[PDB]
Amino acid sequence: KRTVGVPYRFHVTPGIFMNSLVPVADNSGAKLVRVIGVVGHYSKSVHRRIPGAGVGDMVVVVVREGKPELRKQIFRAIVVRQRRPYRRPDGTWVAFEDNAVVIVTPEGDPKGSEIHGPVAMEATLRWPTIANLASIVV
Amino acid sequence: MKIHKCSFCGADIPPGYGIMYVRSDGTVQRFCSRKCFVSAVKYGRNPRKLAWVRKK
Amino acid sequence: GLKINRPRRGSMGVYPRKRAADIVPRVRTWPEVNLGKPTLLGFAAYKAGMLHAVVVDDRPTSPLYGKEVVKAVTVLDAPPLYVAAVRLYTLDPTNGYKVAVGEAWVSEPPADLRRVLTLPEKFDTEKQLKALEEYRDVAVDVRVLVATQPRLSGIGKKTPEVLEIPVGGVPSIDERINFAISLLGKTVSPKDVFTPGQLVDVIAVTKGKGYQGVVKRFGVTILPRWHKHRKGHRRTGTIGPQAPALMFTQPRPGQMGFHQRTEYNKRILKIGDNGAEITPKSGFPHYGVIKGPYILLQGSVPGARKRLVVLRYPVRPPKKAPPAAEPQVVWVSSQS
RNA sequence: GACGGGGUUGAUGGGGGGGCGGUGUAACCCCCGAGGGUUUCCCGAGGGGAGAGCCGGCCCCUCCCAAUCGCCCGAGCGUGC
RNA sequence: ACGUCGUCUCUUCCCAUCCUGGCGGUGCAGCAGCCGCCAAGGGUGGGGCUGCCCGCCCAUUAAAGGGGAACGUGAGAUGGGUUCAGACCGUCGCGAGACAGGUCGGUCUCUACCUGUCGGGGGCGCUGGCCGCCUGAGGGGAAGGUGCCCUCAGUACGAGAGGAACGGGGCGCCGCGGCCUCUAGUGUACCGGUUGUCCGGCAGGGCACUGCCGGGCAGCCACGCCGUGGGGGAUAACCGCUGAA
RNA sequence: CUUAAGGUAGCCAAAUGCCUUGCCGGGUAAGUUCCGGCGUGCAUGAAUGGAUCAACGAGGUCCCCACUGUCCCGGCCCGGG
RNA sequence: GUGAAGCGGGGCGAAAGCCCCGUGGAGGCCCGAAGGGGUUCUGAUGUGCAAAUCGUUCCCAUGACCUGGGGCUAGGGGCAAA
Ligand SMILES: [Mg+2]
Ligand SMILES: [Mg+2]
Ligand SMILES: [Mg+2]
Ligand SMILES: [Mg+2]
Ligand SMILES: [Mg+2]
Ligand SMILES: [Mg+2]
Ligand SMILES: [Mg+2]
Ligand SMILES: [Mg+2]
Ligand SMILES: [Mg+2]
Ligand SMILES: [Mg+2]
Ligand SMILES: [Mg+2]
Ligand SMILES: [Mg+2]
Ligand SMILES: [Mg+2]
Ligand SMILES: [Mg+2]
Ligand SMILES: [Mg+2]
Ligand SMILES: [Mg+2]
Ligand SMILES: [Mg+2]
Ligand SMILES: [Mg+2]
Ligand SMILES: [Mg+2]
Ligand SMILES: [Mg+2]
Ligand SMILES: [Mg+2]
Ligand SMILES: [Mg+2]
Ligand SMILES: [Mg+2]
Ligand SMILES: [Mg+2]
Ligand SMILES: [Mg+2]
Ligand SMILES: [Mg+2]
Ligand SMILES: [Mg+2]
Ligand SMILES: [Mg+2]
Ligand SMILES: [Mg+2]
Ligand SMILES: [Mg+2]
Ligand SMILES: [Mg+2]
Ligand SMILES: [Zn+2]
């Protein structure tokens, strides 16, 4: 059975939303993607509210710039960096320079073989496969 | 209960204050206040050129 | 009905949202607790301000167990209470109403109490205790009338507050009545009522915000594409169908704020004795300084920065009991 | 409107002192200053040191000033079942 | 002379129930599915296309139910369509003209009298006046709703493939009620920088409607933090015990 | 037969195509609109002007980048009411 | 602001001819004040400032241009870039 992440997902302020343009942090071929959905129990919203995702969340993306074969296909990605500041459960406030996602399978397996740049711990702790490829964890 | 120093002004940051900022290359910085954070990042000021940093 | 489903804007459980009749909370429910000895079931203090403390998590199942977590805390300036009277209660046989059957007062009430009570020059406690004892067989509740001592707080005002606090902790009404009699004219410190680490309920009147619009009072949405709408945008479009007419569930502008609210299960972090250890070097903003005992609460409390807050034993406590040891507060933000 | 606190047995608002804080280093003084001219005791954007300066619809202390003088409301009685 | 479609905003009601609770049947092994019954407390969302309603589609989701309220709601909005006067096309007409065929443009008046609703005040009454503290007839409430992960367990079931449940632990999302310690926003209190001009220059200042730019206390505020439960009874659909006629 | 002749060059689901959200491509995750094609075109067509867009447009429409309080989702502030 | 015809110099050239720079100052030319007009917000107003206004955003702005005074055309008639 595949390695278990943490059973908890503390509240995070969402940084990316529907129709956001987010660069990719890996070498899977995609360069830029458009966010078109959020997956999981936290994805349900109310009237007029646009769903959002924070670090560690899984979203549905469409490849906009990248390899010609990969373009216009629908994938799943994990948010690993977020410009929107957010407060960890121990009261620590965090902010990154840039937004970024990692393209993964629906089960959480990364597409590319290497992740560029730093990765939020909440991404690493919820998805152990992402932890195995992240060189820097903050 | 580990006390960090501001990346801009050099002051000590008591727990529960300021933000920890991650640069795009993976370097982690801590800023005691929005004043230091906009000075270091948004405006790119030199801490040696500011009197209030030197006289801190 | 609606074109798109969504919950109603704001609660109707707080209808009517009128100004509270009293600036002091009037607690309706008091729990039945078994502490192995007689004790007051509550306490009253003044809200001083908020800080944040580094607290070591003590929940073994929590994902932050062992770690240090920053939590927002509320400081309550809690000078001791003065017991002035002991009131006995009984059940009315005709309807089952709880009715006061008499009371006994301390012989020499303090001079501050004369600012709110038309008292005689000298009470006679022995007759009143004697007359009270005839109702010992029909007594069902005993409460003490306490008066706050605001001169010992950071507010420094002189007019005190008076409220009944029941005696509990043991099932024996007879044993309860003796303990209440033993407190006449004495004082009760917060440590006598509570132990640090336990959960309490807080009841207080919230901060007044005056007359407010429907967008703030009920959380109704501003009209989308706001500039397009004639006659304003900080409003609901329609105020009802043709039938029924203007209902009581329609959001309207009115008083916001100054209401009595109750909040459950706030953990006591610390019950200190000297206020200098917790007061900031600048003083509490808009309050002052704490010189006597204080209570440290985890989280927020209703009311403004001088309101009198009532702490009681919880009525809806959680299933799993919180840990027996006192919580470890590593550091408070008012300290250096 | 109301509500709450104080009203001289008083710290209720102001003044003065202190605390904490915001900005960012005032005036004066000393050094440097690209280059020019009364050649070098002059002009000169500007830089450094010491000093910060200004300010607070916040907290403490202190009766120095003002919470005064005053103006009103208010039950009281009979009757029968 | 009752303002003509749709949409926005906001409130409530029905149940002929889409999910959430309970129960049964099955051509119900498990995973799933289909069918019926009780049940209206809560939920029922975000987008693309079209003026739409409707309908189709996209990625999610526990599910993304349907209806009534003067086809709820224009003295609340909007004005895309329809459905005035201008104009073009096709068709019809000798002609002026016509088309519920298409197309482009085309004034949305009113200081709220009464009632209602929401909040705020004054008086009288409460069997002489008053002060303080209580009770609780009744009234309001959704104050909560609902998901996910680990374990159970790769276990039960099964030829395999595949693949549960109860119970235990952890956390969210939506709603509600609070709060301002942190972070964010603002902050025409305040401090600094600087442009043009005027006050003879420096200093200090007026004006450029804070001249503009940067920071920013308090206060407010959310994008931040805190709280937000189980139980009892009688019951529905029904499942049983004893038990005669 | 025909009221004489029987729509040529062209152009099209057109501001002209009812059926019709026509059929095929492009564009979007998803396109009743739009663009390029196809044309026994209800009911296109030649000074009744056909085709035709260089320049010009307060003409009508579709798309891309930039930008943003349009919106997610509201908050604070200033002057006048 | 642009820079038509016309006019000078330079370079290349087998002659022809080509290229580059300058001068020149045309146009129902362009941007844009005054002036004229009247598009948007379907803004404000809508018992108005006003029985047609105001803000904002806009169009033209050397000409079929804007404007004063005087004059002519009159009702089944005038006048009409309609
Ligand atoms: Mg709220
Ligand atoms: Mg309008
Ligand atoms: Mg009418
Ligand atoms: Mg039924
Ligand atoms: Mg009608
Ligand atoms: Mg209607
Ligand atoms: Mg109307
Ligand atoms: Mg109406
Ligand atoms: Mg229209
Ligand atoms: Mg029409
Ligand atoms: Mg004809
Ligand atoms: Mg039209
Ligand atoms: Mg009105
Ligand atoms: Mg009125
Ligand atoms: Mg500013
Ligand atoms: Mg000067
Ligand atoms: Mg002047
Ligand atoms: Mg000015
Ligand atoms: Mg042909
Ligand atoms: Mg053509
Ligand atoms: Mg078309
Ligand atoms: Mg055709
Ligand atoms: Mg023809
Ligand atoms: Mg024609
Ligand atoms: Mg024809
Ligand atoms: Mg033609
Ligand atoms: Mg011109
Ligand atoms: Mg219009
Ligand atoms: Mg208008
Ligand atoms: Mg008006
Ligand atoms: Mg022009
Ligand atoms: Zn700093």
Say how many C-beta atoms besides its own lie within 10 A of residue C203's C-beta. Answer: 23
Residue A67's alpha-carbon distances to A31, A73, A105, A113, in angstroms, are 8, 11, 18, 16
Alpha-carbon Rg of chain A, whole angstroms?
14
Give the 3-state secondary structure of residue B20. strand
**Residue in the structure block whose two tokens are 């209703």:** C302
**Residue in the structure block whose two tokens are 């501050």:** C112
Is residue C216 a contact partner of residue C254, using CB atoms and an 8 Å limit? no
Residue of chain B minimizing CA distance to A120:
B22
Please state, in angstroms and rounded to a whole number, the distance separating the CA atoms of residues B44 and B47.
Answer: 9
Please state, in angstroms and rounded to a whole number, the distance separating the CA atoms of residues B38 and C181.
Answer: 64
Contacts of A45 in chain C (CB under 8 A): none
In angstroms, this model's resolution equals 2.5
Is residue C142 a contact partner of residue C166, using CB atoms and an 8 Å limit? yes
DSSP code of C42?
E
Cβ-based neighbours of B16, under 8 Å, separated by 6 or more: A91, C52, C54, C70, C333
Establish whether the CB of A21 is closer than 7 Å to any nucleic acid atom in strand E.
no
Please state, in angstroms and rounded to a whole number, the distance separating the CA atoms of residues C226 and A61.
Answer: 32
Cβ-based neighbours of A46, under 8 Å, separated by 6 or more: C6, C7
Mutate: best of C57, C329, C331, partner B, most B CBs <10 A? C331
**Residue in the structure block whose two tokens are 């942090």:** A25
Neighbour-count burial for A55-73, b at 16+ CB within 10 Å, e otherwise: bbbbbbbebeebeeebbee
Contacts of A98 in chain B (CB under 8 A): 24
- Chain A nearest C-alpha distance from B55 (Å): 28
What residues form DSSP beta bridges with A53? A16
Rounded to 5 degrees, what are φ and ψ at C173? -70, -35
| Interstrand relation of A100-104 and B28-31 (parallel, antiparallel or unpaired) | unpaired
Is residue A17 a contact partner of residue A51, using CB atoms and an 8 Å limit? yes
Residue C83's alpha-carbon distances to A30, B8, C152, C309, in angstroms, are 75, 57, 16, 18
How far, in Å, is the centroid of ligand 9 from the Cα of C4? Answer: 26
Q: C228: which nucleotide lies closest, measuring CA to C1'?
A: E78
- Chain B nearest C-alpha distance from A126 (Å): 20
Tokens of A32: 């830029």
Q: Nearest CB to C64: which of A46, A48, A89?
A: A89
Is residue C58 a contact partner of residue C325, using CB atoms and an 8 Å limit? yes
Enumerate helices (H) and strands (E) in chain A, giving the number of each.
Answer: 2, 11
Say how many C-beta atoms besides its own lie within 10 A of residue C33's C-beta. Answer: 15
**Residue in the structure block whose two tokens are 């002004």:** B9
